Symmetry: D3
Subunit: 236 residues, 6 copies
C-alpha cells in the first residue's frame, strides 16, 4: 500500500541490533535495518529513530554488586550514542541522509538535541536518530520514544519488539484502547511512558521488527501488530 503516516518515531531496543551471538552490533542486521528505513524514506515518510543500549550494556550484575543505579543509567545512555553512531554510518552507506542528535552536547561527535531543529531536518527528509535518552536516569527508552515522538509531532510511535504484538498471555490483540491496556493489566511499556502517550493521545504500534517486511506493512496498513490508541467514547 501507500503510507498511512507522514512522520513516525521508530523505537528499537539495543537488542534489535544483536546477532545470534546475542551481543554487540551485527553489521548485517544493522544494514538490513538501514535498507528498510531507506524504503520508507523513498515512500516519502519522515523517519525519526530512538535506540536503546541493551546490546552493549546490561547493568544487572553490576547492580547486584552494588553499583549506583544513576551510574548504570548513565552508562546505558552512552551505549545508546554508540548505537546511534553505528546507525548513522549505516544509513550514510545506504545513501540515506541522516543526522544523530544527543541529549548531551557531544562536540565533534554529533548534534545536540533541539526539538525545532529536529522537525526542520525531518521536513527536509533527513532521518533523525535520537540518543542519550532524555539526559536523566530512571526513565526508560520507551519514555524517551514517547517524549521525543510528542515533541517532534510524530503521528505514531512504532515499538519494535521480537514478538508479533500484544498477547493476553495465545491470542494477539489487534486494537486496544489505553483504558483497556490498564483494565486488562497488559504489558505494553512502563507506566510512566504509557501515561505520557495516553495524556497526549499518541498512538502506539507494537510489531515484530525481526520479521523482514513487517515495518513497511506497519507503515502502509492497519493489519500488522497491535495498535494502542484513544478509545472511541470521548470526543468524535
Amino acid at each position: 500500500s501507500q503510507p498511512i503516516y507522514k512522520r513516525i518515531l521508530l523505537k528499537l531496543s539495543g537488542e534489535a541490533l544483536q546477532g545470534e551471538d546475542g551481543l554487540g552490533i551485527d553489521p548485517a542486521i544493522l544494514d538490513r535495518m538501514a535498507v528498510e528505513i531507506k524504503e520508507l524514506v523513498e515512500m516519502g515518510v519522515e523517519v525519526s529513530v530512538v535506540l536503546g543500549g541493551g546490546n552493549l550494556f546490561r547493568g544487572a550484575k553490576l547492580a547486584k554488586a552494588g553499583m549506583n543505579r544513576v551510574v548504570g543509567d548513565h552508562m546505558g545512555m552512552l551505549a545508546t550514542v554508540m548505537n546511534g553512531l553505528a546507525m548513522r554510518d549505516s544509513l550514510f552507506r545506504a545513501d540515506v541522509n541522516a543526522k544523530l542528535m544527543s541529549a548531551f552536547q557531544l562536540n565533534g561527535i554529533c548534534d545536540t538535541y533541539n526539538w525545532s531543529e529536529a522537525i526542520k531536518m525531518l521536513r527536509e527528509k533527513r532521518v533523525v536518530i535520537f540518543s542519550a535518552g532524555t539526559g536523566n536516569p530512571f526513565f526508560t527508552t520507551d519514555s524517551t520514544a514517547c517524549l521525543r515522538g510528542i515533541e517532534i509531532e510524530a503521528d505514531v510511535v512504532l515499538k519494535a519488539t521480537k514478538v508479533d504484538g500484544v498477547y493476553d498471555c495465545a491470542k494477539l490483540y489487534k486494537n486496544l484502547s489505553y483504558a483497556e491496556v490498564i483494565d486488562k493489566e497488559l504489558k505494553v511499556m512502563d507506566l510512566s511512558a504509557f501515561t505520557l502517550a495516553r495524556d497526549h493521545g499518541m498512538p502506539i504500534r507494537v510489531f515484530n521488527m525481526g520479521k523482514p517486511g513487517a515495518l513497511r506493512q506497519v507503515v502502509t496498513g492497519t493489519e500488522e501488530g497491535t495498535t494502542i490508541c484513544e478509545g472511541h467514547h470521548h470526543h468524535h
Copy 2:
C-alpha cells in the same frame, strides 16, 4: 617494601575488566582492582588511571563492513567513559576517593578534563580516572596514557598487560632503553605513543596486572616487569 613512585599513571586495557565469559565488565575483577588501587593510595601514592574500551566495543566487524574509522574511534571513546563510570563507582564502594574526567564535556555525568585541576585532585590524594582518550580519532589508548602522564607529571606510565612484560617473541627483558626497543624491533606500544614517551623521557613499566600482587610489586620495587627508559649515554642525571 615502600613505594618508589610519588605519582603514577596506570594504563589498563578495557579487556582487563572483562570476565573469562569474554565480554563486558566483571564486577569481581573490577572490585579486585579497586582494592589493589586502594592499597597504593594508603601507601601515599598518587594514582591516575587511563582506561581503554575494547571489552565493550571492538570495531573490526563494523570496519570490514565499511564503517568510517572516525566513527569507530568515537564509539571506542564513549566505551572508555562507560568503563570510567564503572571504575569510579567501584572505587567509591571500596571507600576510595575518586573522580572521573572526560575529554568530552558531559554535563551531569562527570568532570571535564583539565590538566591543572587533575594535578590539584592528585595532590589532594584523589584517584583521577581519565576517559574519552584525547577527544580525537586515530590515537591509541597508549597514546592517551603517555599524553596524560606527561601533562599531570606522573613519575611513570604503568602499562598493564596479560603478560609478564617485553620478550624477544623466550627471554623477558628487565630493562630497555628507548633506542634498544627501536634497534631490536621490539613491540612495546605504537610508534606515536612511544615517540611521545621518548621525546619527553617518560619511563614505562610493562607488567602483568592479571597476577595479584604484581601492581604492588611494580610500585614498590624495580624487579617486576620490563622498564623502558632513557639510556645512560646522553647525560649524567
Copy 3:
C-alpha cells in the same frame, strides 16, 4: 523537638513565594522562608530545595491562543531559575551557605546540575537549590522533586502546599500508603511523579508551608501534615 531526617528535599511551588498582590516574588515571604531553612541547617539537617515557576509564569492564556506546550514548558523552566536566584540571594543575606544548580548550563549565572557534586555540597552543609526542572518538557515540578530527591539520596520529599495535608475532601489523613492513595483516588501529585516516588520507596510529606512553624514541626515530628509511604504489608 530533634530532627527525624538527615537529608530532605523541600519542594515549593512558585506560588509559595507570592504575596496578596497575586504575582511575582514577595521579599518578606522569601526572607521568612530563608530563616526557616536556616533553622533546619543549624539543627544539622542537609537541605535541598526544588522551586516551581508558577508565580512568574502561568501559561494557560498563551496555551489557549495556540502556544506550543514545549515552548510553555521552556518558559516555565527559565522562571524556576529566576526563583532559584532570588532564593540563593535570600539565603546569602540570612548568612546561610547556598548554591544554585540548573538542569541547563548557565555559564556565569550558576552551577550545572551534577548529582554527585550536589551530594558533596549537602555533606558540606550547603543548601542546594535545583532549578530548570529536568531540562525536558511535559514533566512537572513534583516529578523533578522526586527525581532529584532519589538522585541525592534524600530521606523524604516535603511537598509544601497551602493546605494542611491530604483530605478525604473535611478529614485530614495522617498516614497513607501508596496503594491507598491510588485505591481512594486521592490527589497528591501527578501519576508520573507519584509512580517514581512509589517505585523507589521515597516517602512524601504533604504540609502547610504558609503556616509559619509547620516546616520545623514536619522535620522534627511525625504529627504535622500527611505522610505517604510504603505500606507495612510487603517484607
Copy 4:
C-alpha cells in the same frame, strides 16, 4: 509607501507585551505585533528584534530588600528569553520564519548568539530575536539593542515606546543630532547606550509602538516619531 530601510533592529521593552491588567504577556497584543512584523517582512525588510523583560520581572522591591544587583540583572536577562520564546512562537503562528538567539547557550531551547550566523539568517529573510542581553549585568536593553544593531549592521535602531517620540516634555522633536540631545539635556536612552550609537553613527528612531500603523509608517518614511542621527556639520 515603501521601506526606507533594508535592515532594522526593533527594540521593544518587556512592558510592550504587557496587558492593560499590567503583568506578563497578553496574547492579543503579542499576536498583533507578529502581524505588524509579518507586514515588514512581506515588504522585503530584514527584521531583528531586541526584547526587554520588565513585564515579567521588576526588581525594585527585591533590591530595596538587599538583593545583589548582579543577581537582579541575571533574573532580568532570563525574563528576556521567556519573552523571546513567546515572540518566536507567535511569529511561527503568523506563518513567519523566525529564530531566537540567546547571549547564553541554552541547549535544547534556542540558538546561541553568533553575529555572522545572525547576518546570514537576516539575509535569508528570517526574523532574528535576540535575548539575554549581552550576558553581562549593569547594561541596559537599550545598550543591547545598540550593540546588536551595530554587530549585525542594521540600518537603524527603532526604539518602540508608549509615547510619540522625544519632547521638550510640549513640542515633539522631529530630528535631533547626537550633539543636540546632550546639549539640550534630553532623555533618550542611558548614556552608555547613546554613546555607543553615537560613536558608531547608528541612527535611532523613537516612536509610539502602541499606535497601530506607526511601525509601518516609521519604516516607510521620515515623518513618524523622532530621529536621532549624526549632525551634518562633520
Copy 5:
C-alpha cells in the same frame, strides 16, 4: 613597613606593560617582576584580581585600515588577553602564588569560566584571580572590563597601571580628581562608558606608573602615589 589601605583590589594592566625593550611579545623578566610584586600584596593579606589587555600581542590598526570587520578585530584582541592571562598564571605559579585564570569564554581544558560569585569565593580563599577575554563582546575596552569586574567582585578600588606617574595636563601631574573634574577638564583617563560605569557605582580609580618597581606596593599601602579619582 607601610600596611595595606585596601582589602580587595582590581589591577588593570595594558598588554603593553608585559612588552620587552624589543617593544613586543611578553618579556619573561618583566612578567616575573610583576609576579614578585603581586606575591608581596598576597602575603600582606590583600585579595588581588587582575584584568589584562592584549595590545602587546595584537594591534588591529593595519588590518582595520585594510577593511577588517571591527567585530573580528575585537574577537582577536579578546583571545590575546587569554594568552597574556595564561602567561601571568604560569608566572604566578613559578613564584609560588596560588592563582586562577577565568575567561569570559568557556575554554574547556585551558582555564576556568568566569562566574562572579566563584571569583569572590576564590578571592576570599586568598587566591589571585585573573580575568581574560573581557566581557565576551566587541566595542568594549579593557578599561570597561576592569570597571565591570571590579564592581562585580566588590573591589575597593580599580588600579589602572600605566607607563606614566598619573593623570597629567598632557606637564602638571594631578594628585586628586573627582569624576566631574575629569569630565569638565576633558582629561584622558579612560573611555566615557568605562568611566561612567565607575562613576555611577562609586568605584574609585588610582592611576599609577607600573613601569617603576616599587610603585604597586606604594599604591596599595598609601594614598600618595599616582592620581586618585573618586566622588566629589
Copy 6:
C-alpha cells in the same frame, strides 16, 4: 589554463607565512594576496580547507627558557591559531569567498566548533573551511593537525606551504620521494608523529613555496611544482 589535479585539498600554512617584511604579526597585503589565490582555486571547483599555525603571533622560546610549563605554551599557540583563522576568514569574505572557521575549542559567538562530518558538508557546498586551535591538545604540532584534519575530511592531498621550493638535502632539490626514502635519508619534512600519520593512511604531501606568487595554483594544477611525497 592548466586544470586542477585534486578535488579536495588541505593547505597547511605556518603562522610565519602571514608575517610581513618586518617579520611579525599579520601583513594585510600578504593575507589578501593569499585570499585571491584561494579564490581562484574555488573558482576552478577545488574544495579548500586550510590549517594555520601560530608562530607569527607567539613563539614560546623565551618564556620556555624562563621555565614556563610547555602545556601552557601550547595552549597559547592554539589560541594564536584562532586569531590567524579569524583574520583569514575576514580576508576571504572581503575577497567575496564563502568561508567558515572551525575551532577545536567551542568558542561561542566567535566561530564554529569543529565537527568532521559538518566540515565535509561545508566543503561539498564549496565553502572554504579553516581549522584552528589544533587538536585541542598539547605536544602536537600544526603538521599533525594538518595530517589529522586531512584524513578526517578525506582530502586528496596535504599541501605543506613553506618559504623554499621543496625538500632539499640541507643543495639539491628533490622532486619525488617515498615515505621510506624520507625516513632513511632523514630528510626534514615534518615531525615523526605527523609524518607517520600521513604514511599509515597513505595521505600524499606536496612541499612547495607559498612565498612565490603563483606557486599554489601551479601545485594544484600540475605535478611538477615542489616536492611530492607518496607511497612507494
